[PDB]
Structure formats: C-alpha cells, structure tokens
Design an enzyme around this catalytic site. Sequence first.
Site, PDB file in Angstrom:
ATOM      1  N   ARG A  19      -6.767 -37.250  -2.284  1.00  0.00           N
ATOM      2  CA  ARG A  19      -6.756 -38.711  -2.392  1.00  0.00           C
ATOM      3  C   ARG A  19      -5.327 -39.473  -2.763  1.00  0.00           C
ATOM      4  O   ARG A  19      -4.763 -40.555  -1.734  1.00  0.00           O
ATOM      5  CB  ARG A  19      -7.849 -39.280  -2.574  1.00  0.00           C
ATOM      6  CG  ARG A  19      -8.504 -38.467  -1.903  1.00  0.00           C
ATOM      7  CD  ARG A  19     -10.622 -39.291  -2.045  1.00  0.00           C
ATOM      8  NE  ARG A  19     -10.807 -38.360  -3.580  1.00  0.00           N
ATOM      9  CZ  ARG A  19     -11.165 -39.233  -4.442  1.00  0.00           C
ATOM     10  NH1 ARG A  19     -12.113 -40.503  -4.047  1.00  0.00           N
ATOM     11  NH2 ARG A  19     -11.225 -38.862  -5.349  1.00  0.00           N
TER      12      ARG A  19
ATOM     13  N   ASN B  57     -12.666 -38.106   0.405  1.00  0.00           N
ATOM     14  CA  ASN B  57     -13.561 -36.703   0.487  1.00  0.00           C
ATOM     15  C   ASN B  57     -14.721 -36.805   0.437  1.00  0.00           C
ATOM     16  O   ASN B  57     -15.825 -37.738   0.875  1.00  0.00           O
ATOM     17  CB  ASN B  57     -14.074 -37.062  -1.545  1.00  0.00           C
ATOM     18  CG  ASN B  57     -12.709 -36.300  -2.360  1.00  0.00           C
ATOM     19  OD1 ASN B  57     -13.086 -36.293  -3.758  1.00  0.00           O
ATOM     20  ND2 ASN B  57     -12.168 -36.172  -1.596  1.00  0.00           N
TER      21      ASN B  57
END
Length: 94
Positions: free
Chosen positions: A19, A37
């Site tokens: 990320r 996620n």
Amino acid sequence: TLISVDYEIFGKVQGVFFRKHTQAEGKKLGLVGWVQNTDRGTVQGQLQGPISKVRHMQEWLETRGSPKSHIDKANFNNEKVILKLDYSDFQIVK
C-alpha cells in the site's frame, strides 16, 4: 482524457508494504484514487487520471509493486472516461 479503472493485485502482496509503495508510485505519476487490503489476501483500489499516466501505473501494478512483493496477477476492470477526478489525493484505506 481522464479515466478511472479498478484494480486487484494477487500474490505475495500483503506484509510487503504494498500500500505504501502503491500510494508513492500513484503520487509520482500524478494519479489520485486509493489502495486497500482485502480479506482475501489481495490489494485493491481505483486509479484516476490521464490515460497515459494510468497505463504507467497499470504496468507498475502488474510488473513491479513493492520491493518484496511477488505479483501473481493484476486484474483491471470498470475502465471508464470521467469528466473530472473523484479524488484529490491517493489514499491508503486503513
């Protein structure tokens, strides 16, 4: 021409700072959108910006990712022309 596209990345893509690196690369490419996620071990989100910049990002998502990641597959869908951006930054969704 501005477009929006959705993505989901499969592989060793959690526990590898995916990320953080995705946000950094999106910002480098002048893209907005988000990364998150999923419960199934993948990373998903939406990219928005000029077509050319989106394509660069798509290559990054399917080829490179974060340093420790291993990418099995990148699925893209719902590509559409948009009149203006729906976001003003590239966010990591907690």
